[PDB]
Amino acid sequence: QLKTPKNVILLISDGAGLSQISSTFYFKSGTPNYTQFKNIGLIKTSSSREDVTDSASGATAFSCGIKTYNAAIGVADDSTAVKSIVEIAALNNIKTGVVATSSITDATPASFYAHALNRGLEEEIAMDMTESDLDFFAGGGLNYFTKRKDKKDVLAILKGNQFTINTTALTDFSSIASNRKMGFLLADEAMPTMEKGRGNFLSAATDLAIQFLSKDNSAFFIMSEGSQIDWGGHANNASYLISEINDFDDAIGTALAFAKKDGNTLVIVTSDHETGGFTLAAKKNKREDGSEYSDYTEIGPTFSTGGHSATLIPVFAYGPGSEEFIGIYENNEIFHKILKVTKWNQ
Amino acid sequence: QLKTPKNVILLISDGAGLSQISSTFYFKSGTPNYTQFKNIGLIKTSSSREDVTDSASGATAFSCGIKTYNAAIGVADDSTAVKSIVEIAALNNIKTGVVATSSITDATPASFYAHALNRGLEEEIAMDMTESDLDFFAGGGLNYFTKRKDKKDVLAILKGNQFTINTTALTDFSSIASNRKMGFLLADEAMPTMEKGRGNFLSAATDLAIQFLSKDNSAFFIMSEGSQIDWGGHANNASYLISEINDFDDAIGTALAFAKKDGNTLVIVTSDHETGGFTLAAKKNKREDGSEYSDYTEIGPTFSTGGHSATLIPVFAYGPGSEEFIGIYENNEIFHKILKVTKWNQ
Ligand SMILES: [Zn+2]
Ligand SMILES: [Zn+2]
Ligand SMILES: [Zn+2]
Ligand SMILES: [Zn+2]
Ligand SMILES: [Zn+2]
Ligand SMILES: [Zn+2]
């Protein structure tokens, strides 16, 4: 018999395998927040049709609890829509929020609020937001709501649904505390990279979501995504990847500080899959007559692929029910384990 | 207040990161024995002087509980000998054994019975075996005992220290039951690869060690190594790597089958470091006027280095005391955790 968390925060690092996680132990100032976790599990990430998953099927496994096809958003392998944790939470009177450093219409956040046959239908996904139960969102993607093929103003529709929308900057909590629902659309497409000065957006937005959704002592569910770790991987760009995962680890710290104080919040950290074959290899040196050799004293990160890979992925859990998340299991069981510990029903 | 194990089995997969472990989930018939574990931790593997560890310092972290320099065997950063878990076990009336698919003088097994300034001193290590507290061993390396540069017959010295030695094949338990100590030296250098017909040596030798070392109701400690996973990694040879870790997973099943029947046995599985940047990438499909594109349906393993890497490494533990091994910690704490749960006198 484990305990029962009131609140859940699910932090997803897109594209981070254990090698990416490990970079925080060598390239971050001070101890990584990962070290706060005791309960650790591993997930198998293959989709219903593919050994190597994409972000859409990978996140839909978390949000909806099923294996589905690569590119599916909140639909099953036979393409029928399935209820997401956000919808279920709403039925149980739980407040919900989604935060991402990509466009808010990108595959990972979209899987938590939309149902589409293909992740590329992002203007459809933006419109899906208007029929969702979500109470808070923050990320990029303003173009999908205001510069559309159908020339519709989706912000007006959201505002008609009780959203206050801010397209300028993340504000203090006092600026939003009295709003019924809140959305931040802070870039036309993706948010800036850390290297281009995104700064503390992910941690700040997560803190804002926590304070906003727990107004009046409501239970809440939040998914916050370190979206751009995956992009650093695809580009085989070590400094990009490293700076984005260090930022993610800051957000883990933000979530854990809240949870440890609150005492009734489960924090789950995981990834959808690994990307790039990122490796903390030994530094390579060149001679002059037969160049390359290794120096084990230092790390020179390397990559082996431009795409995703099928390694098992670590899961970290802290708070009431955290022991449910140990062992090795399929990615889609994350959904079922969350429902099990929270007792959120259908 | 954890349970106290009477016996401990430590299985080390040399060079297996989580990507290597994951290959057993795609390239092995049936389900991997890894899935039996619930308690999982992660270790940081850097040595006292180098971000990327070698096998000698990595194994010495486990056997002796200190960070030391790459190439060190059972000695501290200052080259002085340090008391090992095998030496502690012997002082606590525990029977001890070491099994490997490399030469028994290779860095991993040697760290559990020898004290040498440099792993390259394999003839010195073989002599150290003759003065060690080990009661059982099995592996390759007959050359280091009978075809030495110094021409000494160390086989005779082994036998003169109460070891019964077999250089022909592994036997059954009844054959060796009345022997005080048993050593198998079954190859001149390394044991054969799996691809060259090694068969179930690692499982069979571990099972034999368990039976031999538990004679007369004695408690035991065993370290058994899947030594050649590392060599597949160094060679960037997927099928070699995969066949060796599949064999290692069989050995895990052997240990766990004993532990579950026995009920007083802690089984710990970990690795010393990762090698090769082994990645379960998408299979590459070719056309002609476009050449190469990724097909996520299937996996095509890739590598990015010929050397070791500094990723954190998973630790799995089953049995009394196993909860001690969760969370994230330095590799050398493996030693201290084993000492803690067994309650042996230091
Ligand atoms: Zn992804
Ligand atoms: Zn994503
Ligand atoms: Zn991707
Ligand atoms: Zn090694
Ligand atoms: Zn080894
Ligand atoms: Zn090696």
Q: What does the DSSP assignment read for B108-131?
A: HHHTTT--BS-TT-HHHHHHHHHT
Tokens (6 digits) for B57: 């310092």
The verdict on B293 touching A (C-beta cutoff 8 Å) is no
| Lookup result for tokens 């709003």 | A179
Mutate to test the interface with B, among A328, A333, A337 (most CBs of B within 10 A): A328
**Strand stretches in chain B, DSSP E:** 7-13, 39-44, 95-103, 136-140, 163-166, 181-185, 220-226, 265-270, 274-275, 282-286, 292-299, 308-309, 313-318, 327-330
> Please, are residues A276 and A297 in contact by the beta-carbon 8 Å criterion?
no
> Please, are residues A198 and A247 in contact by the beta-carbon 8 Å criterion?
yes
Q: What is the number of residues in chain A?
A: 346
Solving technique: X-ray
Chain B: residue nearest A33 by CA? Answer: B328
Distance A235 CA to ligand 3 centre (A): 10
Instruction: Return residues 62-81 of B near A (CB < 8 Å).
Output: 70
> Please, are residues A159 and A165 in contact by the beta-carbon 8 Å criterion?
yes
The verdict on A19 touching B (C-beta cutoff 8 Å) is yes
> Is there a contact between A299 and B40 if contact means CB atoms under 8 Å apart?
no
Cα(A136)–Cα(A134) distance, rounded to whole angstroms? 6
Which candidate in B22, B23, B55, B63 is catalytic? B55
> Please, are residues A23 and A280 in contact by the beta-carbon 8 Å criterion?
yes
| Lookup result for tokens 């009131």 | A6
Cα(B246)–Cα(B33) distance, rounded to whole angstroms? 10
**Strand stretches in A167-246, DSSP E:** 181-185, 220-226
> Please, are residues B11 and B255 in contact by the beta-carbon 8 Å criterion?
yes
Mind telling me the catalytic residues of A? 55
| Lookup result for tokens 């036997």 | B171
Rg for chain B, CA atoms, rounded: 20
**Nearest Cα to Cα of residue A96 among A214, A204, A4:** A214
**Nearest Cα to Cα of residue A57 among A146, A10, A118, A123:** A118
Helices (H) and strands (E) in chain B, counts: 12, 14
- Residues in CB range of B8: below 8 A, 6 or more apart: B220, B221, B222, B265, B266, B267, B268, B338, B342
For the CA of A231, the nearest ligand: 3
> Please, are residues B226 and B101 in contact by the beta-carbon 8 Å criterion?
yes
> Please, are residues A94 and A344 in contact by the beta-carbon 8 Å criterion?
yes
Cα(B191)–Cα(B173) distance, rounded to whole angstroms? 21
Instruction: Return residues 222-281 of A near B (CB < 8 Å).
Output: 274, 277, 279-281
**Side chain identity at B194, as an amino acid letter?**
M
CB nearest to A302's CB, from B38, B53, B277: B277
Q: What are residue A73's DSSP bridge partners?
A: A116
Cα(B309)–Cα(A251) distance, rounded to whole angstroms? 27
Tokens (6 digits) for A86: 């956000």
The verdict on A49 touching B (C-beta cutoff 8 Å) is yes
* Axis crossing angle, helix A201-213 with helix A238-262, rounded to the nearest 10: 30
Q: Which residues surround ligand 6, an ion (CB under 5 A)?
A: B 230
Give the DSSP H or E segment for A159: helix A154-160
Contacts of A297 in chain B (CB under 8 A): 49-52
Q: What is the number of residues in chain B?
A: 346
> Is there a contact between B277 and A51 if contact means CB atoms under 8 Å apart?
no
Cα(A107)–Cα(A73) distance, rounded to whole angstroms? 7
Cα(A279)–Cα(A288) distance, rounded to whole angstroms? 26
> Is there a contact between B279 and A305 if contact means CB atoms under 8 Å apart?
yes
CATH superfamily, domain B1-346, is: Alkaline Phosphatase, subunit A (3.40.720.10)
At B39 the three-state DSSP class reads: strand
| Lookup result for tokens 């004290």 | B115
Cα(B303)–Cα(A117) distance, rounded to whole angstroms? 34
Chain A: residue nearest B277 by CA? Answer: A279
Mutate to test the interface with A, among B51, B119, B275, B278 (most CBs of A within 10 A): B51
Chain B: residue nearest A48 by CA? Answer: B297
At A266 the three-state DSSP class reads: strand
Residue A339 CB neighbour total at 10 angstroms: 17
Distance A244 CA to ligand 2 centre (A): 13
- Report resolution (Å) to 1 decimal: 1.8
CA A276 to chain centre: 18
Mutate to test the interface with A, among B38, B279, B316, B324 (most CBs of A within 10 A): B279
At A2 the three-state DSSP class reads: coil
The verdict on B34 touching A (C-beta cutoff 8 Å) is yes
Q: Cα angle at A328 between A324 and A331, to 5 degrees?
A: 85
The verdict on A330 touching B (C-beta cutoff 8 Å) is no
